[PDB]
Design a protein around this ligand. Sequence first.
Ligand SMILES: CC(C)CCC[C@@H](C)[C@H]1CC[C@H]2[C@@H]3CC=C4C[C@@H](OC(=O)CCC(=O)O)CC[C@]4(C)[C@H]3CC[C@]12C
Ligand SMILES: CC(C)CCC[C@@H](C)[C@H]1CC[C@H]2[C@@H]3CC=C4C[C@@H](OC(=O)CCC(=O)O)CC[C@]4(C)[C@H]3CC[C@]12C
Ligand SMILES: CC(C)CCC[C@@H](C)[C@H]1CC[C@H]2[C@@H]3CC=C4C[C@@H](OC(=O)CCC(=O)O)CC[C@]4(C)[C@H]3CC[C@]12C
Ligand SMILES: CC(C)CCC[C@@H](C)[C@H]1CC[C@H]2[C@@H]3CC=C4C[C@@H](OC(=O)CCC(=O)O)CC[C@]4(C)[C@H]3CC[C@]12C
Ligand SMILES: CC(C)CCC[C@@H](C)[C@H]1CC[C@H]2[C@@H]3CC=C4C[C@@H](OC(=O)CCC(=O)O)CC[C@]4(C)[C@H]3CC[C@]12C
Ligand SMILES: CC(=O)N[C@@H]1[C@@H](O)[C@H](O)[C@@H](CO)O[C@H]1O
Length: 826
Amino acid sequence: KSYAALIADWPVVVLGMCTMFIVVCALVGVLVPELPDFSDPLLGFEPRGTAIGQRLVTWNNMVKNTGYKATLANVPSDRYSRVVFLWNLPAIKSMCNVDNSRIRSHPQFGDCCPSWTLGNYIAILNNRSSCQKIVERDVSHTLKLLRTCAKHYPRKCTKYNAVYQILHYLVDKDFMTPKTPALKYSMLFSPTEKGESMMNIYLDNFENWNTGIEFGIKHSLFQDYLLMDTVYPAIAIVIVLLVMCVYTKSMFITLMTMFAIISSLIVSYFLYRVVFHFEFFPFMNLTALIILVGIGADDAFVLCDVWNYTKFDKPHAETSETVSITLQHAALSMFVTSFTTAAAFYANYVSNITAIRCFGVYAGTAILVNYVLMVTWLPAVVVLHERYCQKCHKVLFAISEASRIFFEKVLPCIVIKFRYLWLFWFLALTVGGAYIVCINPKMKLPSLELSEFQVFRSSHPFERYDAEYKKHHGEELHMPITVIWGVSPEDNGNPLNPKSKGKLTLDSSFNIASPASQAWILHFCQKLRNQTFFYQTDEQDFTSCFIETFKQWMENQDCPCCSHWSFPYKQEIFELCIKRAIMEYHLDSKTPGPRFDINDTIRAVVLEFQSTYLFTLAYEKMHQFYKEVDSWISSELSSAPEGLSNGWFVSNLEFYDLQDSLSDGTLIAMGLSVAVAFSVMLLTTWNIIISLYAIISIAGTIFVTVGSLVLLGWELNVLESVTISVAVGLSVDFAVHYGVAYRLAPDPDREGKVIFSLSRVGSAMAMAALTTFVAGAMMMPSTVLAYTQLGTFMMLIMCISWAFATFFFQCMCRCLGPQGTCGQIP
Ligand SMILES: CC(C)CCC[C@@H](C)[C@H]1CC[C@H]2[C@@H]3CC=C4C[C@@H](OC(=O)CCC(=O)O)CC[C@]4(C)[C@H]3CC[C@]12C
Ligand SMILES: CC(C)CCC[C@@H](C)[C@H]1CC[C@H]2[C@@H]3CC=C4C[C@@H](OC(=O)CCC(=O)O)CC[C@]4(C)[C@H]3CC[C@]12C
Ligand SMILES: CC(C)CCC[C@@H](C)[C@H]1CC[C@H]2[C@@H]3CC=C4C[C@@H](OC(=O)CCC(=O)O)CC[C@]4(C)[C@H]3CC[C@]12C
Ligand SMILES: CC(C)CCC[C@@H](C)[C@H]1CC[C@H]2[C@@H]3CC=C4C[C@@H](OC(=O)CCC(=O)O)CC[C@]4(C)[C@H]3CC[C@]12C
Ligand SMILES: CC(C)CCC[C@@H](C)[C@H]1CC[C@H]2[C@@H]3CC=C4C[C@@H](OC(=O)CCC(=O)O)CC[C@]4(C)[C@H]3CC[C@]12C
Ligand SMILES: CC(=O)N[C@@H]1[C@@H](O)[C@H](O)[C@@H](CO)O[C@H]1O
C-alpha cells in the first residue's frame, strides 16, 4: 500500500521533496563546515586510546608543557638537497649539464655559492669555478682516489682538506670492489636548503619530463596533485553513465541514477559533518567517490530489468500493482546487497586508528543512504519512463537485444558443459593459493615507512628515491625506557579529533613521603641493576636512577641547607639543594623534578634508563622486547607501596603501536564482516546448504584477493584494512543475489532450475560487474598511490568475485545442489 500508493499518486511531489532535501543539504554543506584541510597527507595516524598511544601522548604532552623559568628559583649539509635518481663515472659532459639547469631562476643564497658538490668538487685541481674536462688529470685523480682507501677508517696525509668523507657521502656507497650503461640520472644537486621555496621553484620549473628528485615537497605537491587526481574520476563517471545508457535503453534513467549517486555522496558528507561531529577529514574520503561509483550504480541494474521483466509478463493492468510487486522483490535484493556491503565499513569503525574510523563512518553512511535514495528514485525512473541516424540506433538496439539473448542461451550451456571441471580447477586454485599465501613467506608489515609511506606511484620520483637512497642516517640507538610516576596517564581529549591531544592531570594521592619510599626506589634500582638486559657498559651518564646523585650529595655538602646528617628524614629542602646540584645543564626532561607550571615541591619523578635491543622499523623483536619489559615493570609496580602505586612504561616506539593497532583493527573488522556476511546470507535464503556454499565462495574469493593482491608487493599498510572490508562486502553482494534467484525458480528440477536461475542472475550481475570493472579500471592511470591502489584493488575484486560466485555456485548446484527444501527451517 504505502510505497506503491505514494509512488503512483504524486511522482513529481516525491521528486520535489527529495530534490529539496538534496539542495538544502548542499547549501548547509557549504555554509557551516570550516574548510577541511589536506595539508598533511597522513594527518593523524597516531593510534589513540590503546595503552602505548595514551602513555606516549602523555609523555609527548610532557614535552610541549614545562612552562616555567627554571624550577629552582629559591659543507654537505644533511638538510640541503640532492637528485640521486645507478652510479657510473663517464661524467665527461653530464655533471655540469645538470648544473646549468632550473636552479637559478630564484637564487635564495644560503650558507652565489658554487653548489655542485660533485662537478666543482671533482674539479678541485685548477680553474677555480667552472666545469672543466681535463681528461688525463680527471681520470688519474678519480681512479687513484677511488682506489686509495675506502673501508679502513691523521696518520696518512695525501688528500686535500676534508676530501674523503665528502667524496664518499654524495656518490653511491656500493663501490667496495677494488675494480674499474647510460641514463643521464645521478646524485649531484646539493642545492639551497629544502622547505616551501623549493616547492615554488619545483612547481614553476618542473613536470615536463626533464634525473628524479628529493627535496621534501611530498606533503605539499600531493595536495596540489589532487587537481589532476580529481580530473580522472570525471572521465570514470561519464563512461560508467554512458555504458549504463547503452544497456538500459533510457538516457533519462541513467542521468538520474548518476545524479542520485553524487547526491548520495554529498548528503552523506552533510549528515557526516553536521551530526557526527568529526572536525577531521582525511584524503581517503575522496577515494570514497571511486568505491561508491562502482557499487552505487549496481543496485539500479537489479531494478530496471525487474521493472521490465514484470510489465511484459504481467499484462498492462495498472501501474500500482506492477510497481508494488517489482518494489517488494527489488527492495529485498537491494537492501541485502547494499547493507551487506555497508556493514564492512561500519564494522571496520571498531578499529582504533583515526583515519580509517573517519573514512569508514563517511563511506558507511554513503553506501547506506545510497540505498534509501535508490528505492526513493525507483518511482522517478519507472513513472517518468512511462510518460516518455535512428536507423543506426535501431541496428544498435537489434544488436543489444540479439546479444542479450545470445548471452542468455550460451552462458548456461557453457557453465553446464563445465561438467564438474570448473569446480576442480578453481577450488584447487583457491585452496592452493590460500594455503601457501597464509603460512610461508608471502607478506609483511609496512616496515620501510617511518610514517613516510608510498603516497605516489613507483614511476614518479619521490617513491623511487626510497629504493635509490637504500644504497645511511640510521644509527643503532638504545630504547630510552623511562618509567616516571609523575602524572596520571589519562587521555582527556576527543579520540576522533587528531588536532586536540589533551592536558596532563596531577595525582594528589601520589606523594613521595619524605621519611619513606626512598629505600623502595633504592631496592628497585638495585633489583633492576641486578636484572639482565640492562646495557650499562658506559658509566659517564651521572643521571641514571636519580638516587646515586642523591647518595653523592648527602655524602658531600656537609663537610641554603647546611643541615645534612644521616639518611632522609625531613627531606624537601635537601632535594631542592640537589636540584641546584643538578642545575650546576641538559635541562629538558632527562631528570625527575617538578615542572609544567609548578611553584611547589616534587610532582614529577621522571626516571631514565638504557635498553637491550636496537631500533628496527619492523614487528617481531620489538613486541617481545615490549612484552618482557612490560611484564617485568608490572611485577615491580606490584611490589610498590601505597605512596607510589601508579607507574607505567614508555619509550620512542610510535611505530610499534601503529603496527599493533593496524593488525588488531583488521582482524576484528574481518571478524565482523564474515559474521554479518553469514548472518545476512541466512536472512535472505532460508536453506543452509546454500549458506555454506555461500561462505565457501566468500572464503575462496577473499583468498584469491589477498593472495593475488600481495604477490603484487602489497603488504598491509593503511588502506589494505578497508580494502579487505570491501572484498568481503562485495563477495557476499554477488553471492546473495545468486541465492534467492535460485531459491525462487518455477520448476522442481536441478538443471532447468539452474538454467533459468543462472540466466537471470547472470543478466543482472554481469552487467553490474562490468559497470564496476570499468569504473575501477579507468582509475589506473594517476599519480597519487591512494587512487591507483583502491581503483586497481576493487577492479580485481569485482572481476574475480562475479565469475567466481557464478561458476562455483552452479557447478556446486549441478551435482551436490539442494533438492526439495532440504535444510530450510521456519
Ligand atoms: C573525489 C574527487 C571528485 C576529488 C575531490 C574534489 C574536491 C573536493 C577537492 C580536490 C582538490 C581540492 C582543492 C586542492 C587545492 C586547494 C587549494 C587550497 O589552498 C591552500 O592550500 C591555501 C593557500 C596555498 O597554500 O596555496 C584551498 C583548498 C583547495 C581549493 C582544495 C579544495 C577541495 C578540492 C577542490
Ligand atoms: C575483461 C575480460 C576480457 C576479462 C579479463 C580481466 C582482465 C582485464 C583483468 C584480470 C587481471 C587484471 C590485472 C591484475 C593485476 C594487474 C597488475 C598491475 O600491475 C602493476 O604492478 C601496476 C602497479 C604498480 O606497480 O604501480 C596493474 C593492473 C593489472 C594488470 C590488472 C588489470 C586488469 C586484469 C588484466
Ligand atoms: C584476511 C586475512 C588473510 C588478512 C591477514 C593479514 C594480516 C592481518 C596478517 C598477515 C601476517 C600476520 C602476522 C604474521 C606474523 C606474526 C608474528 C606472530 O608472532 C608469534 O608467533 C609470537 C611467538 C614468536 O614466534 O616469537 C604474531 C602475529 C603476527 C604479527 C601476524 C598477525 C596477523 C598478520 C599481520
Ligand atoms: C575467473 C578466472 C578463471 C580468470 C580471472 C583470474 C584472474 C583475475 C587472476 C588469476 C591469477 C591471478 C594472477 C596470479 C599471479 C600473478 C603474477 C604477479 O606477478 C608476478 O608474480 C611477477 C613474476 C615473478 O614473480 O617472477 C602479478 C599478478 C598476477 C598476474 C595475478 C593477477 C590476477 C590473476 C590473473
Ligand atoms: C533479470 C535478472 C537480472 C534476474 C535478477 C533477479 C530478479 C530480476 C528476478 C528474481 C526472481 C524474479 C521473480 C520470480 C517470480 C515472479 C512472479 C511473477 O508473478 C507470477 O506469480 C506469475 C506466475 C505465472 O502466472 O506464470 C512476476 C515476476 C516475478 C516477480 C519475477 C521477477 C524478476 C525476479 C524478481
Ligand atoms: C641486591 C643484590 O642482590 N645485590 C648483589 C650484591 O650483593 C653482590 O655483591 C653482587 C655480586 O655480583 O650481586 C648483586 O646482585
